[PDB]
Ligand binder design. Structure first.
Ligand SMILES: CCCCCCCCCCCCCCCC(=O)O
Ligand SMILES: [Zn+2]
Length: 280
């Protein structure tokens, strides 16, 4: 049957992929300066940080409403038989819940998937699902592959400060570094859809080494790896990291790079960089 993919703006997919692939995007919002802005279309991470730097109130974010999703599902079903809706971790956002409430309006026609990921971690799964669907694979085959990716993928990232994670409430296990991190650089990951601690290093360089150490360990035995790099601020840290990965001798066949969306950046904060990755 005809299956259409829907995701939310936090999947942080470049416009040059999502648009032509027929992926529909439901936006999330950033609350700043007393106003509400749509992720990607009306605000950037740089603008948010500039406002903080200037003494403004911290940014907050909002998930889409059930009707935001229902309008998209209704439109998609006008020319499709089923909708596969992929979203940021249910433990990080109420987005999945809103999607599920909207899905009830089209019983049998919408499958909502909690990817337990964020940013391009969600985006890479959307792209993998699309790749399979365009070849002609069944919903089942695709859902089975998505479950494999949920269980088996890689992610490491660092941030300039843990303050945005703390204030926004998504710090999760990284809270262990609050009273123990000092001046060191934190290395974080996600497990079961929740942020967790994954080491600390003296200096940006050592931090990158620790991330490549983890990557090599995870990469063992894999013949085809696709990586997705993300950043907020300037691209140098992530660029050096991507270079070190592409020169590691590991079989990385894809190494896409994009800036984090304003919604994700509102929680990670400035100087965020890292990468998600999976194999096939
Ligand atoms: C790969 C680098 C990015 C890693 C991102 C993990 C850090 C947690 C992100 C939290 C985003 C929370 C968005 C909430 C949106 C909302 O429902 O209001
Ligand atoms: Zn309704």
């Amino acid at each position: 049957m005809r299956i259409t993919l829907v995701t939310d703006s936090t999947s942080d997919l470049p416009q040059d992929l999502r648009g032509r692939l027929g992926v529909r995007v439901v936006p999330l919002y950033v609350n700043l300066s007393g106003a509400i802005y749509r992720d990607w279309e009306e605000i950037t991470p740089t603008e948010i940080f500039q406002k903080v730097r200037e003494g403004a109130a911290f940014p907050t974010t909002s998930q889409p409403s059930p009707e935001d999703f229902a309008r998209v599902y209704r439109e998609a079903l006008e020319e499709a038989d089923h909708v596969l809706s992929l979203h940021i971790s249910g433990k990080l956002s109420g987005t999945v819940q809103s999607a599920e409430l909207a899905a009830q309006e089209f019983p049998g026609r919408v499958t909502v998937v909690d990817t337990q990921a964020a940013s391009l971690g969600v985006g890479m799964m959307v792209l993998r699902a699309k790749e399979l669907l365009e070849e002609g694979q069944s919903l089942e085959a695709v859902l089975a592959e998505l479950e494999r990716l949920r269980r088996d993928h890689f992610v490491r990232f660092s941030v300039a400060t843990l303050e945005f994670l703390k204030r926004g409430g998504r710090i999760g296990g990284a809270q262990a570094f609050l009273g123990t991190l000092l001046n060191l650089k934190p290395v974080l990951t996600l497990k079961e859809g929740r942020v967790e601690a994954a080491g600390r290093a003296r200096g940006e360089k050592k931090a990158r080494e620790e991330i490549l150490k983890a990557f090599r360990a995870w990469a063992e035995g894999r013949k085809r790896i696709r990586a997705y790099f993300l950043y907020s601020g300037d691209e140098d840290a992530v660029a050096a990291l991507r270079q070190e990965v592409l020169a590691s001798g590991l079989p990385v066949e894809e190494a896409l790079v994009n800036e984090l969306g304003a919604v994700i950046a509102s929680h990670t904060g400035p100087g965020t960089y890292g990468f998600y990755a999976y194999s096939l």
